[PDB]
Write a protein that binds this DNA or RNA. Structure first.
Ligand code: K
Ligand code: MG
Ligand code: MG
Length: 148
RNA sequence: CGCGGAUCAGUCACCCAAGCGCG
């Protein structure tokens, strides 16, 4: 199957619950999706964040699924960040997500009901309700896929 | 590459050190 990458920012309070005791949860998730998942270590934050990074590699569907799981776990806090997803895209993909004078991010936001913003990489922050975020991430991933 | 799993890690896995191998 065709393999793709997704980098997601995880607040440190959520990492415990996505790895699980002795790694059980992350293993299961990797085994069930076929995805490979790597978190940066506890104090390895994305430049100018307090967030760890989660490298996911797998099929388009596995990326949406892994990210769906991560979102859920983040939604169970120890305020703004409860309902955001941040992902890291190459400048190339960043360019594709925006679109001619912002047409594309506007289309995405219409289709999702999410509020999407962009900060050699940029972080994309998606804002809204679970199903809204999940929808926008699907469109974003689709544009990760389509960039050669 | 395989076994291993120091130290880190506080739901902490994978990766990574010693050490011991197979090719
Ligand atoms: K090993
Ligand atoms: Mg091992
Ligand atoms: Mg080794």
């Amino acid at each position: 199957g065709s393999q793709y990458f997704l980098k997601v920012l995880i607040p440190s309070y959520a990492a415990g619950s996505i790895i699980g005791k002795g790694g059980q949860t992350i293993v299961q998730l990797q085994k069930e999706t076929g995805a490979t998942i790597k978190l940066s270590k506890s104090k390895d934050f994305y430049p100018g964040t307090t967030e760890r990074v989660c490298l996911i590699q797998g099929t388009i569907e596995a990326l949406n699924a892994v990210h769906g799981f991560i979102a859920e776990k983040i939604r169970e806090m120890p305020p703004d960040r409860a309902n955001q997803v941040k992902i890291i895209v190459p400048n190339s993909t960043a360019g594709l997500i925006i679109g001619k004078g912002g047409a594309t991010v506007k289309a995405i936001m219409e289709q999702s009901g999410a509020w999407v913003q962009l900060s050699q990489n940029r972080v994309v922050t998606v804002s809204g309700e679970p199903e809204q975020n999940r929808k926008a991430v699907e469109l974003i991933i689709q544009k990760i896929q389509e960039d050669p």
